[PDB]
Amino acid sequence: WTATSGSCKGRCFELQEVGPPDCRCDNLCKSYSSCCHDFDELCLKTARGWECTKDRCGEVRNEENACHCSEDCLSRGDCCTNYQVVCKGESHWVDDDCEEIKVPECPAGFVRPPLIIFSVDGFRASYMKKGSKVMPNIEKLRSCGTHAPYMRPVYPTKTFPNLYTLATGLYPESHGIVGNSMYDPVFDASFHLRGREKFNHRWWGGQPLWITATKQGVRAGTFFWSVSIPHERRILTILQWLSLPDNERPSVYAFYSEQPDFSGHKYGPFGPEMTNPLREIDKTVGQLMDGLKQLRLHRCVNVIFVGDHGMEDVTCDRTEFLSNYLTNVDDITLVPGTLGRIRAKSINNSKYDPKTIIAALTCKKPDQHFKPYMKQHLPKRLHYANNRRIEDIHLLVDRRWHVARKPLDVYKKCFFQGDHGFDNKVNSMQTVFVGYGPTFKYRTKVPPFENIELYNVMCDLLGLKPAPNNGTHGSLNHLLRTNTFRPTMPDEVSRPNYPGIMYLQSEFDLGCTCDDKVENKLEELNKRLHTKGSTKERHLLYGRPAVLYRTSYDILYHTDFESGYSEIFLMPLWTSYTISKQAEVSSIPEHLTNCVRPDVRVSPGFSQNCLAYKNDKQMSYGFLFPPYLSSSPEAKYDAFLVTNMVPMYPAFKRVWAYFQRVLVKKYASERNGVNVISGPIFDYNYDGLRDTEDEIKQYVEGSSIPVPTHYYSIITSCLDFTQPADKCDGPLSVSSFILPHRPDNDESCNSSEDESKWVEELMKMHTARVRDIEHLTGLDFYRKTSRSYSEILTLKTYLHTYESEI
Ligand SMILES: *[C@@H]1O[C@H](CO)[C@@H](O[C@@H]2O[C@H](CO)[C@@H](O[C@@H]3O[C@H](CO[C@H]4O[C@H](CO)[C@@H](O)[C@H](O[C@H]5O[C@H](CO)[C@@H](O)[C@H](O)[C@@H]5O[C@H]5O[C@H](CO)[C@@H](O)[C@H](O)[C@@H]5O)[C@@H]4O)[C@@H](O)[C@H](O[C@H]4O[C@H](CO)[C@@H](O)[C@H](O)[C@@H]4O[C@H]4O[C@H](CO)[C@@H](O)[C@H](O)[C@@H]4O)[C@@H]3O)[C@H](O)[C@H]2NC(C)=O)[C@H](O)[C@H]1NC(C)=O
Ligand SMILES: COc1cc(C(=O)N2C[C@@H]3CN(C(=O)c4ccc5[nH]nnc5c4)C[C@H]3C2)cc2ccccc12
Ligand SMILES: [Ca+2]
Ligand SMILES: [Ca+2]
Ligand code: NA
Numbered sequence: 102w103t104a105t106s107g108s109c110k111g112r113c114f115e116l117q118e119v120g121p122p123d124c125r126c127d128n129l130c131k132s133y134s135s136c137c138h139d140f141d142e143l144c145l146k147t148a149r150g151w152e153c154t155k156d157r158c159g160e161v162r163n164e165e166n167a168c169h170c171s172e173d174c175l176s177r178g179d180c181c182t183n184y185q186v187v188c189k190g191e192s193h194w195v196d197d198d199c200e201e202i203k204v205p206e207c208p209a210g211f212v213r214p215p216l217i218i219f220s221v222d223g224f225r226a227s228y229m230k231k232g233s234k235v236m237p238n239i240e241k242l243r244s245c246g247t248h249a250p251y252m253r254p255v256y257p258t259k260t261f262p263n264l265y266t267l268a269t270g271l272y273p274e275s276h277g278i279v280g281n282s283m284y285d286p287v288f289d290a291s292f293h294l295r296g297r298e299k300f301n302h303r304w305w306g307g308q309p310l311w312i313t314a315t316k317q318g319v320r321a322g323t324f325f326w327s328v329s330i331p332h333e334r335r336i337l338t339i340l341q342w343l344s345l346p347d348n349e350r351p352s353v354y355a356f357y358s359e360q361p362d363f364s365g366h367k368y369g370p371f372g373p374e375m376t377n378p379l380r381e382i383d384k385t386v387g388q389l390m391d392g393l394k395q396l397r398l399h400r401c402v403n404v405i406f407v408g409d410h411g412m413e414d415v416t417c418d419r420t421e422f423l424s425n426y427l428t429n430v431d432d433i434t435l436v437p438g439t440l441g442r443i444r445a446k447s448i449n450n451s452k453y454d455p456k457t458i459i460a461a462l463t464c465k466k467p468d469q470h471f472k473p474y475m476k477q478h479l480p481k482r483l484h485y486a487n488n489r490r491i492e493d494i495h496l497l498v499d500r501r502w503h504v505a506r507k508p509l510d511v512y513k514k515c516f517f518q519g520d521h522g523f524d525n526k527v528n529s530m531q532t533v534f535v536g537y538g539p540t541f542k543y544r545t546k547v548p549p550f551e552n553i554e555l556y557n558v559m560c561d562l563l564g565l566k567p568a569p570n571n572g573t574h575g576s577l578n579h580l581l582r583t584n585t586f587r588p589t590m591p592d593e594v595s596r597p598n599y600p601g602i603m604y605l606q607s608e609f610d611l612g613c614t615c616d617d618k619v620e621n622k623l624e625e626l627n628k629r630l631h632t633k634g635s636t637k638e639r640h641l642l643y644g645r646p647a648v649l650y651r652t653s654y655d656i657l658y659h660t661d662f663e664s665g666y667s668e669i670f671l672m673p674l675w676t677s678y679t680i681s682k683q684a685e686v687s688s689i690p691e692h693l694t695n696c697v698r699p700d701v702r703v704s705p706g707f708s709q710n711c712l713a714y715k716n717d718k719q720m721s722y723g724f725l726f727p728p729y730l731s732s733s734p735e736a737k738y739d740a741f742l743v744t745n746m747v748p749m750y751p752a753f754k755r756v757w758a759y760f761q762r763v764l765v766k767k768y769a770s771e772r773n774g775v776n777v778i779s780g781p782i783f784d785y786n787y788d789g790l791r792d793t794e795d796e797i798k799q800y801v802e803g804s805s806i807p808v809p810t811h812y813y814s815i816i817t818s819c820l821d822f823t824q825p826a827d828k829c830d831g832p833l834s835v836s837s838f839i840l841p842h843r844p845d846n847d848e849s850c851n852s853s854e855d856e857s858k859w860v861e862e863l864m865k866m867h868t869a870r871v872r873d874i875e876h877l878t879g880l881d882f883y884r885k886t887s888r889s890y891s892e893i894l895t896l897k898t899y900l901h902t903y904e905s906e907i
């Protein structure tokens with residue numbers, strides 16, 4: 102119930118929200134069907150439009166007008182945004198030359214530069230270049246301020262997940278808004294675009310910017326706008342709030358535009374109908390900047406122009422139907438479109454089996470345009486699994502396509518020509534970032550970055566302490582003139598042991614054999630030097646990784662590689678080695694095919710054993726430092742140490758062996774040497790975080806050897822590739838991956854072919870940030886470089902995407 106008989110007189114767009122049954126006058130009252138009877142008359146005035154004209158200048162104030170051109174309007178804070186241009190001979194902001202804002206130039210009473218977020222739905226990154234001719238205001242913000250060529254959204258590349266990620270710094274799996282449509286099985290409740298459930302606070306997790314600000318005593322404008330409020334009125338409302346007395350005035354504001362997304366869905370991303378929406382958004386930017394200029398705030402406010410995601414060409418004819426795959430199509434519920442999420446239609450049906458559903462959906466048609474995954478098998482870079490609202494079965498849909506349950510869903514629900522939601526590395530899904538103001542840099546281009554990083558920066562811009570989030574605070578310091586956040590490196594928690602030779606060969610009963618008993622002070626002293634770390638500077642280029650949790654581990658040195666060996670997990674946490682451009686690949690000699698060698702520095706009790714692999718009929722083993730890349734025949738024997746062995750399914754060994762034999766050398770050729778750090782990852786509860794020993798669900802049969810869920814590699818070289826990786830004077834270049842350790846290659850439909858036709862494709866799909874590996878391992882990399890810590894944080898957030906030019 103709402104008693105709509107109260108009044109909005111003097112309460113229009115009030116900031117404090119009033120609770121039922123008292124009638125509301127705030128910018129969301131329309132969405133709640135709760136506005137006071139006179140809200141339209143008083144608060145949504147439209148008389149005489151949005152622009153001053155010559156004849157209105159110095160008019161007698163008429164309170165019915167949408168905005169004013171009378172002499173008193175400046176002091177009332179309610180002139181039309183072009184008032185000073187029409188009536189007082191001023192220029193439009195867009196017409197003024199760009200001049201560096203070296204310091205904030207703020208009116209008295211302003212405690213800090215205000216922040217205005219200008220968010221645009223479906224604004225695809227390439228619109229900045231492709232639409233530049235029809236967006237002069239936006240082009241001026243972009244060229245004069247700080248801009249990225251694009252900003253990466255979160256998966257899924259849907260509206261609410263991305264807007265709320267912008268507001269929180271969190272991945273969707275953590276904030277809880279995991280799609281535009283959701284079912285929560287604990288609440289037994291459904292979230293939809295239409296209706297009232299979506300307003301219940303239980304859906305919205307984390308701590309959004311407006312709450313962070315309020316808790317720390319920084320006032321916020323309301324971020325949300327009911328669709329029926331015209332954009333011109335939203336801008337006038339923001340400008341009016343900015344004229345409030347100091348103690349009442351918010352410091353942070355958001356404007357939201359439904360365009361260009363609305364038209365993009367109808368016309369496709371580059372339909373000729375798209376020019377007009379782009380013009381109109383630019384005009385709105387112009388209105389804001391003109392109004393800021395009137396308030397003398399155009400060189401005081403920080404403005405962020407940011408989109409939520411892009412837009413791809415998608416039409417009804419490019420739809421895959423599950424009814425062409427599944428016999429049991431009425432036993433499932435599908436969330437459809439540019440991603441698929443499948444669950445059982447009834448929880449009372451015990452003939453439901455996810456394994457048979459996945460199998461019926463796997464490589465069934467030659468050009469199949471989606472791929473099924475159990476959620477824990479999705480690329481870890483999507484961070485899309487750790488929430489009960491994410492269904493166990495997920496369909497990753499190719500760009501330009503939809504998935505639907507049955508054909509009748511698509512015609513009895515072509516209308517649309519655009520959609521979004523696809524994998525967040527897809528070029529068409531990329532969106533925009535521009536920052537303009539005293540706190541941002543002048544005429545500066547920054548590399549692409551992820552939208553999870555912005556919350557921390559917005560907190561920095563407002564002097565706020567961010568709530569715990571998924572940005573890496575300091576990684577975006579290069580966007581900022583001042584207010585940088587200067588983080589310290591985390592302290593190492595566990596210090597390593599440095600074991601010498603402590604065990605005789607006969608103490609080991611591992612069931613391993615090696616033809617190594619074939620045999621000199623010239624060469625013997627030298628081998629001893631290698632075991633004490635004499636080649637370490639070559640192979641450990643950026644310091645040893647720090648272990649940020651409590652554990653027991655040993656540093657092991659060798660001619661060709663160094664490792665951090667876990668006595669708890671019985672294998673390395675990391676293995677580090679450098680491969681120069683000149684390095685040569687060799688084979689595993691015939692006599693060494695099955696060679697495994699006890700490591701006399703490490704006790705039998707903290708070693709793996711070969712018998713466990715002999716007896717586990719599903720599990721084989723691989724090596725972290727590859728024997729193929731040994732520096733000499735004699736050095737090769739180190740690669741067969743039991744302390745360099747890791748458990749691998751035969752199907753995974755196909756992938757790993759090709760990476761090690763073919764790709765590492767290829768990367769060293771192309772990049773002028775590479776440094777590689779490889780290791781295992783254990784994430785059995787798919788939370789993106791390192792498992793403790795008691796979370797491990799699978800062991801090599803009969804043994805305490807844990808089976809990794811994933812294997813990573815971090816591949817570093819010199820950004821200036823005229824310098825070799827091991828003698829780099831400046832910035833670094835990195836690419837990394839987190840490969841799923843799976844017992845089949847069902848993910849790769851072409852896997853019966855030679856590895857040259859499918860392995861690198863798999864690896865590209867599983868590209869990762871160094872930071873993603875940090876979370877999954879509790880390790881901290883790049884501890885000893887010549888680079889600034891902020892630069893290193895940016896390097897750690899880098900993702901190599903393998904997409905072509907934007
Ligand atoms: C991205 O950044 C984020 C934020 O920093 C990281 O997420 C954090 O990770 C922490 C570890 O996973 C986690 O810490 C836990 O907090 C528990 C208390 O949680 C409540 O309070 C916080 C603080 O206000 C709040 O934010 C939480 O909000 C979550 O939950 C509600 C839903 O109920 C949602 O509205 C909201 O979206 C959010 O959900 C997300 O996180 C939860 C986990 O909290 C998931 O379940 C969801 O799927 C979703 O992803 C909560 O309201 C605290 O109870 C935990 O402590 C347990 O475990 C430790 C182990 O050491 C132990 O000491 C305790 O005893 C306790 O164990 C007991 O419970 C167990 C399980 O029931 C049981 O098995 C035991 O036997 C014990 O009885 C824990 O400390 C923190 O909450 C989240 N924060 C957020 C916002 O998500 C995230 O990791 C980052 N991602 C990456 C990849 O780096
Ligand atoms: C918390 O959510 C936030 C909300 C808002 C806000 O007013 N709205 C209201 C709009 C309603 N709406 C759609 O009807 C819609 C739009 C595009 C689509 N494509 N496909 N389906 C789609 C459905 C999108 C909502 C956004 C602003 C924020 C601004 C900053 C941060 C968070 C915001
Ligand atoms: Ca959107
Ligand atoms: Ca985990
Ligand atoms: Na085996």
Ligand code: NA
Nearest residue numbers: 846847849852
């Ligand atoms: Na296959």
Ligand SMILES: [Zn+2]
Nearest residue numbers: 223260362366
């Ligand atoms: Zn949309």
